[model samples]
Target: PAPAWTTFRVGLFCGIFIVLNITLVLAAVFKLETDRSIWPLIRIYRGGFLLIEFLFLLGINTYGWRQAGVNHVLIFELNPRSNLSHQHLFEIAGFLGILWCLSLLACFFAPISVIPTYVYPLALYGFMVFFLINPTKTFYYKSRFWLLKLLFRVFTAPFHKVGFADFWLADQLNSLSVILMDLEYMICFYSLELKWDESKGLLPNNSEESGICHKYTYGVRAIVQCIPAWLRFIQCLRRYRDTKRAFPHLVNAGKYSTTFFMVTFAALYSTHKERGHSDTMVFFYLWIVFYIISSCYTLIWDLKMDWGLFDKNAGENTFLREEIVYPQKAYYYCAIIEDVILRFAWTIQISITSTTLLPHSGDIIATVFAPLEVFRRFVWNFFRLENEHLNN
Candidate 1:
């Protein structure tokens, strides 16, 4: 009989261990309100994200132990038909090196704007689509680059402010974009690997048993862990009633923080069906369908959610049986304006550039509809703003 603990199970354990650590970190962030505790929780949260990443690689190494001893360069020619090609196997190492380079770049430009930050995600998606589809058609480099740029911009736009350059706002957008990028990378890779394994008559086994895929799985978990961290921070700020009253902007930031991810997921689901395909022109058409569906849903639902939340909180100025000194009216108003501008920019970009993927009819429609969507989001924003004041 096999031993109670095997190599496969050990790998799975490591992956789950990383996830639980993240949950603990999140709980610490959310459950504690003291500044001393909150700062430490933030540290733990950051550390947990990094540690999960390390454990993910470790899990991969453990699962690939048999292949580890093989002479990578020599094995290339000797077993050219093996599932693991030298290039493909070494690609993991190359990827880590690239990630390290990117991290260093991120560190150097900590507060950088996320827009136009394309090299990494673009390169990654390019490689992924190629590996999956292996098309006879040549790569559509220019088109792919712009499409990805637009996607990233839309995902990060919720954090932007209208008519002003707020440094903190910029920082939030940059940080949020980095997080969103990481999330997209992890989820896409996981889906790809799962598909690959499924094609080979395997299933997504426990991470403990199959270290091969834990990196992407755990990476997704890490991103999910962020929710509690933000929620907790908001609760902490609310606890210091007087402090919160004076500095209402902090609470304001909290209300709309969830908007990015909500829209991001909607965007992902809309485009997910086309992710690994290589037929660029075909993929673009599919992407347009996704863009339209996602944009419409995001705008409508966002407005709806915002209005509901504003109305609910408007009447209830009570916090823990005490009438709150600061009302959330300003925060609610600002979010509407911010949402409008951000969504409009995104809708416009999608409408204009996305149709380039299609031929004459599509292109013409895209050109005209792009501005129309922008106008739509603008009108939505205006309505949200007007309604806010009218309700008061």
Candidate 2:
């Protein structure tokens, strides 16, 4: 069959999935009491954010690598010709998109009984877990196992030899702070037996009785939020050991270690909140200070190390490097702008105001910023991999 003819089936399912997704979305929207969203919608997004983006950013990143003629297979150490392609990724994303949307729709329509709707996501979750660990040859098990092995390596970072795929995965995890936060919170949520009531669709309501445990939640938040950074930090130490260098690796480790203090400060502020007479302004101030410093360090690391841009040595290219692999030079400059703007996100002030001026903007602000960070990571991947490819 011709390529166009061969793709008809793929296109058909995606189209159907898209239509169903639209139907569910509109129905859910119309079904809502007000224009403002309730808990269920946010609940779905809490986990839903990561699952679908797994399909999307992956597709886009691979597509860019392939389009640029980078040997991603070698870089990723993936299967030679049998690795998952962008088209295949899109197809999977489409089908999974349908399932994810359906889950949210169910949350909207189904009774919020303890057992009934609680397990609604269990079907999707069950399948996802099974899909990842499934022993059979069906689906992309090679890639699945590869990713699993990488995650295992991340969890046991000290024991493993650091590699591109290893830290790269952890770096991506760093951007997904919200997902890990939600996942950690939910893990404790069920264990704490808080999901046993009317407000119990596994939706966090920010209360001790109705929501999650206050004390442990912040501890979990600090622990979980710092885990990604910790993974990278340990990898830096391992790299330091192997490379016998005290400069970048040590400095890099410091960058991640800052998150320890920053995250702890954040936890302290949230949980201990301004002991009546005064708030935890000291911890709050320290967190803000560490936050900006870490942001600057990370931004510098992105330019100086990761992407290797801002080379004053080049005359014509100006701020760019000596040699360029990708065709477009404008994208390099543009990426720096995107990176700088998004590093500070420079948009938080607007959200800050929005939270004060509008209803539900606080929730909307969280929702908005998480995706922005994700987008920044996807953009960062393009240049990071491109830089790696060019150097290799």
Candidate 3:
């Protein structure tokens, strides 16, 4: 018989699965009532894309699980000597960044026509193909995959020539993409709120109803508010340079840049709160706070891995030390747990908010499936037997 704890965990997993599937079915029926005219089409579109996104996520997690095994040894056993490779991490970030962009566009534009919804997923599919090809070529060099090699070589040559700057640019763009997507959602939601207010006679029906003075004032205020994000991005570049020089041991520029961006976002959220933004904005601010906290913790973990700064003999006298003392296995496991929890929470929060803001059948489907996808990955990490198979 399985151990009691294992049985309990299995039962807990089953219960969650039942609840999630029930919710999805309920949401689908409710959506069908309002979306009856296009219910069939919506299901086809959403179901197809949901399958595609799950496949992409599966590919990403399969890669991540393999890389996590590599990183575990590199951080714990090899210590500072093992050269950190963030290639897999970058690919994951790129894919997720593109996915978020598509989701946001679908949320904002799906109401007008189904065409935009179809286009974004097609683009996402193409992007994932390109993302996968480069890594496959690198991993199977002796296999001499000529077609993919030539394709990726031509595509990646320009970036390779730029060296570290390419990495910096990739990380910066990925981080910026998230911020831009959130900002776009915020503006869209705010505009929709204004329209809703006007419909109920709570605000002016149109810009002209408020006169030219109101228009000018609103325009100027928007421009002024946007200045901070722009300035922060500029400062981020400077900070990246300074940190690179000061902490020469650190490999991932994205880590520091993301940390800075999260802090800036938190400050911006606080500023908005002070200016009396809506409750929706307050909800968004709280998520920003959560992100800041998670990013800070990730930064510390990155530093610990890079420098072996948390090892048992980390602060001991350098000359007196005969051998390096590694940290406990539990420490590394905690790091992985922290990473997974943060990622899962972020995925759930964004998925839920996206569906709420958009409230379309497709958005609803995506939201319902997002947690399931994460849970699937969670199960895959334990049961897939990648470690044993790869070892043999």
Alpha-carbon lDDT, every model: 0.38, 0.69, 0.40
Q: Which model is ahead, 1 or 3, in terms of TM-score?
A: 3
Off by over 4 Å in 1: 1-293, 307-356, 359-362, 390-392
Please report how far candidate 2 places residue 329 from its true position, in Å: 2.3
lDDT score of residue 358 within candidate 1: 37
Per residue, candidate 1 scores C-alpha lDDT tens digits across 188-269 of 5455533442232223344543432222232343344344335334433443443445443454444334433433443343
Candidate 2, backbone clash total = 2
Mind sharing the TM-score for model 3? 0.24
Q: Can you give the TM-score per candidate against the true fold? A: 0.22, 0.86, 0.24
Write down the RMSD of all candidates, one decimal each. Answer: 25.9, 4.0, 21.3
Give the residue spans of candidate 2 off by over 4 A: 1-6, 35-37, 111-116, 193-208, 213-218, 272-274, 277-279, 346-361
For model 2, how does the per-residue alpha-carbon lDDT over 149-252 read when each residue is reduced to its tens digit?
87898778798888888888888887776677666555665677454656434443544464442243435546766777788888889889999988898889
lDDT winner among the candidates? 2
